[PDB]
A paper describes a structure:
BoNT is a protease which is produced by Clostridium botulinum as a 150 kDa protein which must be proteolytically cleaved to become active. In each, the C-terminal part of the heavy chain, the binding domain, interacts with specific gangliosides and protein receptors located on the presynaptic nerve terminals leading to endocytosis of the neurotoxin. The N-terminal half has an all β-sheet, jelly roll barrel fold, while the C-terminal half has a β-trefoil fold.
We have solved the crystal structure of the binding domain of BoNT/A in complex with the polysaccharide moiety of the ganglioside GT1b, the first step in cell recognition. Six of the seven monosaccharides in the GT1b analog are clearly defined by the electron density, while Sia7 is disordered. Trp 1266 is conserved among the BoNT serotypes, and on BoNT/A is located in a binding groove that makes extensive interactions with GT1b. Additionally, the indole nitrogen of Trp 1266 hydrogen bonds with the carboxylic acid group of Sia6 (3.1 Å); further underlining the importance of Trp 1266 in ganglioside binding. Glu 1203 hydrogen bonds to both Gal4 (2.7 Å) and GalNAc3 (2.6 Å) and the carbonyl oxygen of Phe 1252 coordinate Gal4 (2.6 Å). The GT1b complex crystals grew at pH 5.5 which is comparable to the pH inside the endosome; this indicates that the neurotoxin ganglioside complex could be stable also inside the endosome. The GT1b analog complex reported here represents the toxin bound to the presynaptic membrane before the translocation process is initiated.
Author numbering: 873 to 1297
Amino acid sequence: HMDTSILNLRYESNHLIDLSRYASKINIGSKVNFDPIDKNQIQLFNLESSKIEVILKNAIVYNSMYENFSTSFWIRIPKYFNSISLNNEYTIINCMENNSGWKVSLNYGEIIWTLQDTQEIKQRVVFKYSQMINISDYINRWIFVTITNNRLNNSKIYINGRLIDQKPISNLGNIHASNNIMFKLDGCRDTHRYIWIKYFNLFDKELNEKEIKDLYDNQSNSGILKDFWGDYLQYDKPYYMLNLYDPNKYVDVNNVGIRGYMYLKGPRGSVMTTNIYLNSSLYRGTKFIIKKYASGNKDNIVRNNDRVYINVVVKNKEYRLATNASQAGVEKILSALEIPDVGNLSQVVVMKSKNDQGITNKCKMNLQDNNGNDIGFIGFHQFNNIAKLVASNWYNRQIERSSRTLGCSWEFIPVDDGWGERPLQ
Ligand SMILES: CC(=O)N[C@H]1[C@H](O[C@@H]2[C@H](O[C@]3(C(=O)O)C[C@H](O)[C@@H](NC(C)=O)[C@H]([C@H](O)[C@H](O)CO)O3)[C@@H](O)[C@H](O[C@H]3[C@H](O)[C@@H](O)[C@H](O)O[C@@H]3CO)O[C@@H]2CO)O[C@H](CO)[C@H](O)[C@@H]1O[C@@H]1O[C@H](CO)[C@H](O)[C@H](O[C@]2(C(=O)O)C[C@H](O)[C@@H](NC(C)=O)[C@H]([C@H](O)[C@H](O)CO)O2)[C@H]1O
Ligand SMILES: [Mg+2]
């Protein structure tokens, strides 16, 4: 019931603007890049001209001993690859003037908030994430950041709606920030470093936990499905597959045609740079390509509830994911068929957002027959030492967001420069 955002930076009518009543002025550098499909996604390189300056009206400049405030934004931080990034804190969003104010900085495996008063008393809160982890929720993936400040007690950093760190700030006196917010990599020794950022907001209160969860939901709610990294899922784009129940396995094929089958096998194997990262390999297994069937949209974005076909790439040729639903048993084993020879086999897939918390990249694929009847969500089943891919209505009968729907939840991983792995072939 009360307008609390004092800066709401959004792309509208061909420009990045402040949608708040204050209409703060935006100065964009010549080397800022916007994502072609989602122009709210902004890429800042390690270059002087890759910067955005927001000029705040005097009335909303922070100059206070007592006023509470918060900031929120989404960020996508490429994996750290090189030892030059160790012990190298670099500013990314700066509202410091004359050694007072606030800033967001990054370091190897860290997002850091710093406040500083006009007597050089500082406090930091820090989110630390590991690069020695099989599959990370955070590395090179869109994550939601929220930072809140209550002058009588704590500053708090939340990640994806969850409190990560809080520290006292009650001893800080007057904080007098800048009338400019500078979005720019400052002090970064890795010449190849960049970030992606979106939906920057400032608020004139300490947001509460409910408000933050609502913001997280509202800014991630979409009728558009997303890939593993959090970008829009697309038609006609090759993806490697991740199953959420068995994330250390990958999809392979045991022969094409109706007597062959798709299956999961593992482990993935590792990608590494000593002392810098150790992760599971993501570019493994047969690539899938999502093909238009029913959608009347002319763009190539995959939307929630779109009915599609799934192609499987085998030896640089596309096959159709399909099954004969008449086979005995609820689990219908999936095959990779020659496209011209699919005939009346079941092949139409409803792409469904799991509608879990956060980004709409947890995908379910409901296979339907040619009369539109459900054959079931695509998952896997042990026969009995091989984990074959199946469509099964058993999944459709399970409790939502429970253990028994992990097996039919998938993510789609395209090659991305922020991950840096080299495919084996
Ligand atoms: C065989 C089996 O265990 N499940 C298969 C099921 O078999 C039936 C009975 O199993 C259920 C059921 O009725 O569906 C499973 C339900 O979840 C239970 N409900 C609840 C609320 O818990 C239900 C109850 O326990 C019933 O009241 C029990 O009757 O049971 C199964 O117990 C029963 O087995 C008989 C047995 O045949 C007899 O010999 C014996 O005398 O008595 C027992 C008990 O009666 O058989 C029932 C019919 O055969 O049948 C369905 C089809 O209807 C499925 O095949 C089901 O297997 C599941 O298949 C789906 C795909 O359809 C997936 O492949 C599941 O795999 C995963 C998954 O969850 O995705 C993969 C995971 O890797 C695996 N995890 C681990 C750690 O290994 C999980 C795991 O089983 C759990 O789901 C953990 O989340 O499974 C696959 O399990
Ligand atoms: Mg939601």
